């Protein structure tokens, strides 16, 4: 059986899997967030892509479709038809809840770019059915990439909250076949996130469960998941010291025992590398990071 | 010890290494193109990055710096100083010659985006010295990504030519420590390029030497290059048939002997077969 590995690369060199952004820190969620249900950045340890997750960052947080001035009818990024009533959205479709999106729209064969402003809360935002509001985008075929975010237009006065996913469905029907929620299974554990700075009018930090380069590594390697959890060390490349032990679970996420938001994984330097140690029990008791 | 491998992934799922774009075809260069000197998408087979090439697509074709309204003083993408007279440009800096750039500029802590229009021909375009003309971008710190391209502003009337790289230096000083040029090896071999459609007012196709996901793979694996060239098969995942043999050379590029590679489907996987002589004669595709 092909042994399980993670890339031999420092975190500071890798990308977020929910937007095309460099990784800037390791984080944990606020205490009111115990589970997440991101649709991008979802890959099992044996390399199975889940939700809207693509293999490549060139598909991450992008849209493709044709505006008629009222709606944008979505396709996959390469132009392939997207069928409604099947999944949350096309592959790579942005999954940042709790914000308005500002998508930079360009066209094959035409000059210029256009800022497309997306409130994800109205009933016209229905990517599960292949359609989202045009909000002023003129008729034409476009490809767009998320460029910056801002506070949600609704509810009035709410804050940016990137721990959420958008409402892919509507009053007509709920979206189906979402990637399931992930939660920390072990004693005292919390989910671990890879954070990126996101442009926009605040100090926005976008969390994801796995760097995009881990995803393409796993999707290629497809190492059989022969244990309940993968024990990992976060290794300092200067000294070789183990800065903390972590567990990666088969569904494709990491946990740790923090010993604190003010002293724990968030204070770890970002120049380190995650290294597989051995397969351990789902209930292996991790030593606190900080 | 570590065996050489390439990712077990179909080409159509991977990205260009000169811009964050999906791969849409395999191409070869026109006959008037005798060498290429791309600065992004340059990685040896044992994982050494060359030119401005980053590990990750999140750095590809991006800029970072502070405008004073006259110039943009460039930094690395994370803000680290970029010193003059050392390399062509910061890591990830766009390397598309033969066109004007239109870069989407955003800011940490501020609303809005701004289109930054870059003519790479004037004497104020000197990324080798750490600065390029602001061309109207107001004062502030920005991060930018290449969004679309158009024909170069100078010489007037010239066409887009993505086989070129920009002029990183100036009339006073040539840029130094560029990734070296790549040349066709001979024996009827031609360089193989991975192509992407680039937005803008034409049918633009952007060539690169390696998909970005190959680069992060090699940079991680760092398999010793124990032969002169790596013989590869391009495999059809439906039938398992070999669609054509290729050679990957240590400096980080592929060739074949070409109706040829440009008509190959993009849903195949490149698979390492064995190490061979640099003068190993390939069967025509």
């Amino acid at each position: 059986t092909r042994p399980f590995t993670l890339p031999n690369l420092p975190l500071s060199s890798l990308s977020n899997s929910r937007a095309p952004l460099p990784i800037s820190s390791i984080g944990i969620s606020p205490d009111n967030v115990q589970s997440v249900q991101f649709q991008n950045g979802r890959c099992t340890l044996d390399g199975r892509l889940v939700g809207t997750t693509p293999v490549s960052l060139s598909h991450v947080a992008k849209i493709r479709g044709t505006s008629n001035g009222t709606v944008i009818n979505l396709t996959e990024l390469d132009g392939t038809p997207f069928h409604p009533f099947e999944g949350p959205a096309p592959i790579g479709f942005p999954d940042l809840g709790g914000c308005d999106w500002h998508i930079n729209m360009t066209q094959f064969g035409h000059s210029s770019q256009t800022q497309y402003d997306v409130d994800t809360t109205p009933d016209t935002f229905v990517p599960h059915l292949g359609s989202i509001q045009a909000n002023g985008i003129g008729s034409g075929n476009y490809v767009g990439v998320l460029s910056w975010i801002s506070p949600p237009s609704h509810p009035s006065g709410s804050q940016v909250d990137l721990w959420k996913i958008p409402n892919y469905g509507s009053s007509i029907t709920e979206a189906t076949h979402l990637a399931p929620s992930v939660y920390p299974p072990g004693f005292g554990e919390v989910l671990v996130f890879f954070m990126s700075k996101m442009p926009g009018p605040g100090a926005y930090n976008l969390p994801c469960l796995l760097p995009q380069e881990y995803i393409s590594h796993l999707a290629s390697e497809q190492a059989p998941t022969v244990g309940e959890a993968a024990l990992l060390h976060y290794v300092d490349p200067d000294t070789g010291r183990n800065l903390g032990e972590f567990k990666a679970y088969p569904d494709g996420f990491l946990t740790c025992v923090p010993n604190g938001a003010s002293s724990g994984p968030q204070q770890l330097p970002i120049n380190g590398v995650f290294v597989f140690v051995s397969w351990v029990s789902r209930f292996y008791q991790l030593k606190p990071v900080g | 010890t570590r065996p050489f491998t390439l990712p077990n992934l179909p080409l159509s799922s991977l990205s260009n290494s000169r811009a964050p774009l999906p791969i849409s075809s395999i191409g070869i260069s026109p006959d008037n193109v005798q060498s290429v000197q791309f600065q992004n998408g340059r990685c040896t087979l044992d994982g050494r990055l060359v030119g401005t090439t980053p590990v990750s697509l999140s750095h590809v074709a991006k800029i970072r710096g502070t405008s004073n309204g006259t110039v943009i003083n460039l930094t690395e993408l994370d803000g680290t100083p970029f010193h003059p007279f050392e390399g062509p440009a910061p890591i990830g800096f766009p390397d598309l010659g033969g066109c004007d750039w239109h870069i989407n500029m955003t800011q940490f802590g501020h609303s809005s985006q701004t289109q930054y229009d870059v003519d790479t021909t004037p004497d104020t375009f000197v990324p080798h010295l750490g600065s390029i003309q602001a061309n109207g971008i107001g004062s502030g710190n920005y991060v930018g990504v290449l969004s679309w391209i158009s024909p170069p502003s100078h010489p007037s009337g010239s066409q887009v030519d993505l086989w070129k790289i920009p002029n990183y230096g100036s009339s006073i000083t040539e840029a130094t420590h560029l990734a070296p040029s790549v040349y066709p090896p001979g024996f009827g071999e031609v360089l193989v390029f991975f192509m992407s459609k680039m937005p803008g007012p034409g049918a633009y196709n952007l060539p690169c030497l390696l998909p970005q996901e190959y680069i992060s793979h090699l940079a991680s694996e760092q398999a010793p290059t124990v032969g002169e060239a790596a013989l590869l098969h391009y495999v059809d995942p439906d039938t398992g048939r070999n669609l054509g043999e290729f050679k990957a050379y240590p400096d980080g590029f592929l060739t074949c002997v070409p109706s040829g590679p440009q008509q190959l489907p993009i849903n195949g996987v490149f698979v390492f077969v064995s190490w061979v002589s640099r003068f190993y004669q390939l069967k025509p595709v």
Partner: nanobody
Amino acid sequence: QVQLQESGGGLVMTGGSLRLSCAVSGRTIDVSVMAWFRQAPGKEREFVSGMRWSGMTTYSADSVKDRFTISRDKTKNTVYLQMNSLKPEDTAVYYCAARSRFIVGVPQARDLYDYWGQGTQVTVSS
């Protein structure tokens, strides 16, 4: 995430025919292989027939190669198993299975498939 739902099982007399169907829903864009397996009492699960979902290659086990045919519906995301000249030894629970991870060819190992249906009983009486 991919959902599989089989139908069409039941009782058939020896020598008869039966067509199983499996509805594939969810993330079908990068499903690469669809297959049928079967598990008889006191025996291990066995590969029956498989196809490249968007390709043309198929493969059937030697015990059924001249009698069973796998195919994809031209309109809907449904895979079929056409079973002809059924024998009592064909009695089993038949399972639909999907492979999404990239692979060359049609795998026969059960542990390489990514998604499984709930199974449908086929009984061949003599």
